[PDB]
Structure formats: structure tokens, C-alpha cells
């Protein structure tokens, strides 16, 4: 079984920023892409962005740019997801997701072959 962990549940004030984690192993971290989604509370989920673990290329949802940013380090080998402008209505379970294999001759970043999922990072905010 592949090893996969996020940062635990988090708490903020509305309008603040978040730094949710994902630190998997079992495969070399530059093998498969990393994806993030927002599981709404009683509504359909929404898609945030994807990581190329091997390069600085990034892409995010067409509605979430500016609100979301997301980076990675290789000294410790972990990637961090960020989101500004939190509200009480968007409090949700934020999931780390594994993408498709990384090929240098064709693009598979957007393939939704999500074989592995994190345990879920709940975030809730209050005044």
C-alpha cells in the first residue's frame, strides 16, 4: 500500500491564509502529479490545482487564481498549498490527491487517474 499523509485539521480566522500539507512516500515523489480539491459541506466538490513535483510549473482552477498559490521544496521533499480570502461558507475538507505518472514526451497532468487520496484536512473558521 502506498504511504500518503496530509497536515491534520486546521483552524484560522476568515480572510486569513492556510498552508495545508502533503508528504507521501512509497514512490519517488517526482513520479506522479499532486492534485487538490475542496469537498463542499453538502454540495458538489470543487477543484483547486495541480503540482508538477519535478518542476516549477503550476496550474489552478479558472476561478481560484489569485486566491490560491502553491509551492514545493526539495530539501525536505514536501509541497504546500495556500488559499487566501477564507469564509465561513467555504469551510470544507481539503484533500490531497495523487495524479498520473510523469512522462517527459506527453502531458498527463490533467488526467483524473486519482488512485490515492489523503486523509482529509478539515478547515473551519470563526471570528
Amino acid at each position: 500500500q502506498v504511504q500518503l499523509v496530509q497536515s491534520g485539521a486546521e483552524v484560522k480566522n476568515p480572510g486569513a491564509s492556510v498552508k495545508v500539507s502533503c508528504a507521501p512516500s512509497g514512490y519517488t515523489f517526482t513520479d506522479f502529479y499532486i492534485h487538490w480539491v475542496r469537498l463542499a459541506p453538502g454540495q458538489g466538490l470543487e477543484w483547486l490545482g495541480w503540482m508538477n513535483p519535478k518542476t516549477g510549473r503550476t496550474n489552478q482552477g479558472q476561478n481560484f487564481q489569485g486566491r490560491v498559490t502553491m509551492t514545493r521544496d526539495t530539501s525536505i521533499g514536501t509541497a504546500y498549498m495556500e488559499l487566501r480570502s477564507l469564509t465561513s461558507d467555504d469551510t470544507a475538507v481539503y484533500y490531497c490527491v495523487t495524479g498520473a505518472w510523469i512522462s517527459d514526451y506527453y502531458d498527463s497532468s490533467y488526467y483524473p487517474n486519482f488512485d490515492h487520496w489523503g486523509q482529509g484536512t478539515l478547515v473551519t473558521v470563526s471570528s
Partner: protein, 111 residues
């Protein structure tokens, strides 16, 4: 984003057959077969049971199967039980350069 029109609930007694669909736009699925379906179950981590529209990853009963026609795809089902109740979702290719997901649905199988 287009929240694909999932029917919020289609169900009946155990052993029934249903088809969870979700429909979008001419541009999204008309050039790819990138569709996958997921599960949610009182708050636990999700499951992953169909991908590439009609392909099975591994530990999945073949009751679940895929279908496609133009702007819409579906998750075909036959032979349900109470354990099959879950929040099923569809997420597929949504243009440059991302995926988009539907409105969700609950299989309210009775009992």
C-alpha cells in the same frame, strides 16, 4: 465553472438498476475519454472505482460500468444493496488545463 448536472438522487429497493449521469458542454469531453468517478461515506476518505470512462482500477465489482454520448457520461449500475449508498461524484477534463466536477448525488436506496 460548470457544475455538471448530476441528478441529486436516483434509487429504489435493493436489486434495482440506475444510471448516474452528469452532462456538460460541447468542449469538455468531446475530445477526450478522461472521466473518473469517486465515493464518499459518512466523512471517511474517498474511494476510486471507475476511470477512463469505462475502465476498472482493480477491487471493484463489475456492477459499476461506464457509458458516454457527446456532452454526457454515466455510471451504470445494477444489483444494489444498502452498503452501496454513498455520495457519488463525477470529475472529468474541463479545458485549459484542469478538471471540473459535478454537483454530486446520493443513491438513496431504500430499506
Amino acid at each position: 465553472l460548470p457544475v455538471l448536472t448530476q441528478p441529486a438522487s436516483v434509487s429504489g429497493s435493493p436489486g434495482q438498476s440506475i444510471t448516474i449521469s452528469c452532462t456538460g458542454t460541447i468542449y469538455d469531453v468531446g475530445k477526450f475519454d478522461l472521466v473518473s468517478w469517486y465515493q464518499h461515506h459518512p466523512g471517511k476518505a474517498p474511494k476510486y472505482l471507475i476511470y477512463e470512462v469505462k475502465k476498472w482500477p482493480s477491487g471493484v465489482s463489475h456492477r459499476f460500468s461506464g457509458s458516454k454520448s457527446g456532452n454526457t457520461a454515466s455510471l451504470t449500475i445494477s444489483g444494489l444493496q444498502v452498503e452501496d449508498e454513498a455520495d457519488y461524484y463525477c470529475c472529468s477534463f474541463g479545458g485549459s488545463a484542469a478538471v471540473v466536477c459535478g454537483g454530486g448525488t446520493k443513491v438513496t436506496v431504500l430499506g
